[PDB]
Design a protein around this nucleic acid. Structure first.
Lengths: 46, 101, 131, 217, 123, 343
RNA sequence: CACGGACCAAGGAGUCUAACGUCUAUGCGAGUGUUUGGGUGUAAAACCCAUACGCGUAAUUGAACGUAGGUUGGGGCCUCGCAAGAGGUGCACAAUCGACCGAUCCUGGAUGGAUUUGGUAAGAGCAUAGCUGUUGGGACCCGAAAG
RNA sequence: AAGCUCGUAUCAGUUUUAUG
């Protein structure tokens, strides 16, 4: 039979995936915020 | 338990520990992968363990589980390691499936 | 500030190790208070009599608010109607344990309380008198 | 007693204990008695499972332990509008004993043996909701099972039962229900009452809100 | 490995360790208030202090780059199998030449560097 | 209820007879308490020693006072013998009166609370239930069929050492008996000639409920010690304050342990005694931390190591790459140089 | 200035004891202390305790009418909320004002009470281990006119 | 050295204005 993965390991993997699905979106949000902040800083310096 | 055993062997004179001048606590136990008496390395402090030992030219993958803690006479099981290096590595990985990295 | 426990008891060291992680990863001040109290010396941890717990349980909604004591719980013959409630402490005296159990309550260790209430919801920490 | 062989240190004796229990349990007339005997038998089975710590064999033991529920009063009767008389009440006692043993001996499970008990409870839950009548659909059987299960595992008002078991139940309920293969009494979603029951464990409420109510099903 | 920078190679010597024979070379701090060494006046012997602390990344490492580890028998030698690069087997002075050859053979078999090989041996 | 431990025959075979766990091995393990109690007790068997009070006083000497340009320490009078003029009564003088002579009324025994003594004994007994702890004690228990080792009561009836040693070898204690009689080394230091000439490592401990000859049969084999369930000496259970001695128990002794130390049904069999209550429900903290309930209310964790940031300060006004990062307007500045604007 | 130092091997000095304390640790806990002894014993070892005894458990005669206390803060917990913050509930601790029962100090052996009074308030203590302080014993070591 | 609260409005071998 196929050795089933540990239940604790399955829960850990699910939690890691759920956290990564939000961290990835937060990375893009941070990149967009950084771009906007750079534009604002450029205009303020000018 | 493991925590009680771990702390007793750590701070209550583990018999097989060796103190090097550099300040590293060694472990001469034959059943340890590493000769350092740190946590998750000393076989006595962990219920689950895996190690490689040889008596004849053949190499054997030694491991233990809580199924045999109550019976030290059958504490450690072994399997021929398929001394072909490429086959041996994959066999070890398959045997240690789901084990700690 | 006291940062380590002077007690040589390994069990207290394990409790401190668990509570440090709980406080650092939860952010709830309830864990911080218990962790800080765990370092208190014996003179700084006076026993909490069962009578004190019984009289403190008159607080509104205290029936469902499990009481917590960081010291030791001692029996008290001055009372005979200890409310049915759950009390968590490091050590429970034989008389206090019998009184709590006989009254339909329960006695648990600090680790059990932490598992039941990782965030300390409905918890009530009592401190023994010093005067 | 029978529990002595189930908790024996010898594998041969332990396996023979289960082999004999397969009939001792289908001897229903003998087992239609107080729930204390069922609790003791399940406590012995707990030790029997505890004595095996090998991945594949532990799954082999877990599957048979879960199938023991189906073995109890196999639905060959086909109870056409018949109540729990002498058939389902006895199985309710076995189910109650299983949960009592699991809750009482929860913290005693070591770190490595936790996965074994998670698999065992998953298998037992799969056998449950599969065997109430010949299949899941049954009004009175579901009502009795809910009242005899809601009060122990998912109560959430009594801190005596650790919330880890409710967490596992939340995580595996939908995974195991779909294993039965579209409409079912799934009245079973208890979870709304837990959410409405204020002062309950906030961790359990958050877990049920996130993992359970967020599913499209 | 990181360079082995020795902050103070010269061995520290006790004040007047050479002026009087009754004063051992072992360092001992001067206790008198009037002592010039205690006040570290210019031109006096250097006084050991926290400044000369060797770095952890190179502490206890011999110039060859291997840490010394006393070995009493084959059992002790076998413990360095997983740390051959970082540790070297050093035979104790009390080991008879009979066991020294056996220890050296095992060290060569395992590739463990020997700090003082051939001691008491003849070819 | 409690789990059961199989009973092994004198030939190593595991007999079908099984006994429940005596509930004593589940008591808390407190290395600090055991160490303190052992240290206090070990001083009880200490014989007092002292220096002769009349030593040094058997000399006639008086201080010369001054004027002789010599030390004021009293010097023996008379002449011709040669001892005259030598210092006396001084701790610094040769053959003088040693400073702070050891008196006979110095403390030798240490008072220990009976409850603490029982706690230490219970902890030592419990420590024997863990094979890993016993292995860390230095006993070659790697081949014992079961732990704790339970043997049939017929072992107590053995009268000849030749049979007892054979039974111990068969059951699995052969390794420990070989370890003993091998580590026998001559005493190091001045103890060589104080009746402490030889020393050896401790051997297996045998526990019996009744004495029929085993105590005499096993006394001659080095390392092996015999004790009664009622006594269960702490000095023997944890020699050197180190827990986890290899102990062999008889099934009758295993049953009698419940009565001698108490259980959940028989209170203690001792007036006013009760086993200490654990302050932790789960011995291992990892299970609590890794439990689903706690992990569900725990914030995410890092990579276990902090990533170094700004390890080296790049100086602006040079290395234009870093300058643009601080001020994006630097590019526009450099487009016309922004500095040579003509009014 | 002076006190000692020609040199070297060995020797050489806050050590022990009794009482009274702080702190720390352990055991029990309103109980505590087996070891003056008795039983037992592989024998100064190891293991148990019948009766008494020291301490505390309560006293200005006696303290439940109530959180064996209202109010205000007060670690903490809960609801509201993304936060700020609001509300509800509160250990020890602090302020205020509280209840019985006795002395000031009136009153006339009481009575009613003037205004502060010291307890109950709500037990928190007993045994052992370590550093440490005072006192007496030679008292960190050497030494003086005498009887 | 150890215990409570507070990280707050707590202070200052500092300066200036107002009460002479």
């Amino acid at each position: 039979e196929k050795i089933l993965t540990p239940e604790s390991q399955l829960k850990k993997s699910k939690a890691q995936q759920k956290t990564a699905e939000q961290v990835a979106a937060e990375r893009a949000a941070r990149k967009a915020a950084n771009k906007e902040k750079r534009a604002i800083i450029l205009e303020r310096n000018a | 338990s493991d925590e009680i055993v771990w702390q007793v062997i750590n701070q209550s004179f583990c018999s097989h520990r060796i103190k090097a001048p550099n300040g590293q606590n060694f472990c001469r136990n034959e059943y340890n992968v590493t000769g350092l008496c740190t946590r998750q390395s000393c076989p006595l402090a962990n219920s689950k363990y895996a190690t490689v030992k040889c008596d004849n030219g053949k190499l054997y993958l030694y491991m233990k589980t809580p199924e045999r803690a109550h019976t030290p006479a059958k504490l450690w099981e072994r399997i021929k390691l398929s001394k072909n290096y490429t086959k041996a590595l994959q066999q070890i990985d398959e045997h240690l499936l789901h084990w700690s990295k | 500030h006291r940062t380590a426990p002077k007690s040589d008891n390994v069990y207290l060291k394990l409790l401190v190790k668990l509570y440090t992680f709980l406080a650092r990863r939860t952010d709830a001040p309830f864990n911080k208070v218990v962790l800080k109290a765990l370092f208190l010396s014996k003179i700084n941890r006076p026993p909490v009599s069962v009578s004190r717990i019984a009289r403190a349980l008159k607080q509104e909604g205290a029936a469902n608010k499990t009481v917590v004591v960081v010291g030791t719980v001692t029996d008290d013959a001055r009372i005979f109607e200890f409310p049915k409630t759950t009390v968590a402490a490091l050590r429970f005296t034989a008389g206090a344990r019998a009184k709590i159990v006989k009254a339909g309550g329960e006695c648990i260790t600090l680790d059990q309380l932490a598992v039941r209430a990782p965030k300390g919801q409905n918890t009530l920490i009592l401190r023994g008198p010093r005067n | 007693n029978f529990v002595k062989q189930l908790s024996s240190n010898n594998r041969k004796t332990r396996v023979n204990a289960l082999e004999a229990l397969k009939k001792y349990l289908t001897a229903k007339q003998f087992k239609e008695n107080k729930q204390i005997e069922f609790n003791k038998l399940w406590k012995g089975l707990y030790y029997a499972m505890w004595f095996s710590d090998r991945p594949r064999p532990q799954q082999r033991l877990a599957n048979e332990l879960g199938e023991l529920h189906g073995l109890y009063f196999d639905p060959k009767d086909n109870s056409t509008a018949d109540e729990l008389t002498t058939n389902d009440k006895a199985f309710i006692k076995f189910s109650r004993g299983f949960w009592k043993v699991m809750c009482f001996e929860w913290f005693n499970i070591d770190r490595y043996r936790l996965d074994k008990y998670l698999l065992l409870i998953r298998r037992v839950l799969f056998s449950q909701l599969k065997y109430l009548q010949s299949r899941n659909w049954d009004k009175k059987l579901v009502d009795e099972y809910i009242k005899k299960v809601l009060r122990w595992l998912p109560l959430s008002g009594s801190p005596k039962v650790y919330t880890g078991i409710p967490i596992h139940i939340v995580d595996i309920l939908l995974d195991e229900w779909e294993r039965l293969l579209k409409k079912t009494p799934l009245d079973v979603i208890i979870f709304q009452d837990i959410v409405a029951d204020y002062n309950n464990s906030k961790v359990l409420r958050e877990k049920i809100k996130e993992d359970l109510f967020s599913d499209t099903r | 490995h990181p360079k082995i920078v020795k902050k103070h190679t010269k061995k520290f010597k006790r004040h007047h360790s050479d002026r009087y024979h009754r004063v051992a070379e072992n360092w001992r701090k001067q206790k008198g208030i009037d002592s010039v060494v205690r006040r570290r006046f210019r031109g006096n012997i250097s006084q050991p202090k926290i400044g000369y602390g060797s770095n952890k990344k190179t502490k206890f490492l011999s110039p060859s780059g291997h840490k010394t580890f006393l070995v009493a028998n084959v059992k002790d030698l076998e413990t360095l199998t997983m740390h051959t690069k970082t540790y070297a087997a050093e035979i104790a002075h009390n080991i008879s030449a009979k066991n020294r050859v056996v220890i050296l053979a095992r060290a060569k078999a395992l590739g463990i560097k020997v700090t003082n090989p051939k001691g008491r041996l003849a070819l | 209820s409690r789990p059961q431990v199989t009973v092994h025959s004198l030939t190593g075979e595991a007999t079908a007879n099984a006994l429940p766990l005596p509930a004593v091995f589940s008591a808390p393990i407190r290395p600090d308490i055991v160490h303190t109690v052992f240290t206090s007790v070990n001083k009880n068997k200490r014989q007092a020693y002292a220096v002769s009070e009349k030593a040094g006083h058997q000399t006639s000497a008086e201080s010369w006072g001054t004027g002789r340009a010599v030390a004021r320490i009293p010097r023996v009078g008379g002449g011709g013998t040669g001892r005259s003029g030598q210092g006396a009564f001084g701790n610094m003088c040769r053959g003088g009166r040693m400073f702070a002579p050891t008196k006979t009324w110095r403390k030798w025994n240490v008072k220990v609370n009976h409850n603490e003594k029982r706690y230490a004994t219970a902890s030592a007994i419990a420590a024997t239930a863990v094979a890993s702890l016993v292995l860390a004690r230095g006993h070659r228990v790697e081949k014992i069929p079961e732990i704790p080792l339970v043997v049939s009561t017929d072992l107590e009836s053995i009268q000849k050492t030749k049979e007892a040693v054979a039974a111990l070898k068969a059951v699995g204690a052969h390794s420990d008996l070989l370890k003993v009689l091998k580590s026998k080394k001559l005493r190091a230091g001045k103890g060589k000639y104080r009746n402490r000439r030889w020393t050896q490592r401790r051997g297996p401990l045998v526990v019996y409920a009744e004495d029929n000859g085993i105590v005499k049969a096993l006394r001659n084999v080095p390392g092996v010690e015999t004790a009664n369930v009622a006594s269960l000496n702490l000095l023997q259970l944890a020699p050197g304050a180190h827990l986890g001695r290899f102990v062999i128990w008889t099934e009758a002794a295993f049953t009698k342990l419940d009565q001698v130390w108490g259980s959940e049904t028989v209170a203690s069999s001792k007036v006013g005694y009760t086993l200490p209550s654990h302050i932790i429900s789960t011995s291992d903290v990892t299970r609590i931390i890794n439990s689903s309930e706690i992990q569900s209310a725990i914030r995410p964790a890092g990579q276990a190591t902090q990533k170094r940031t700004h390890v080296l300060k790049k100086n602006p006004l040079k290395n234009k790459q870093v300058l643009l990062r601080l001020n994006p307007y630097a590019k526009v500045f450099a487009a016309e140089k922004l500095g040579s604007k003509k009014a």
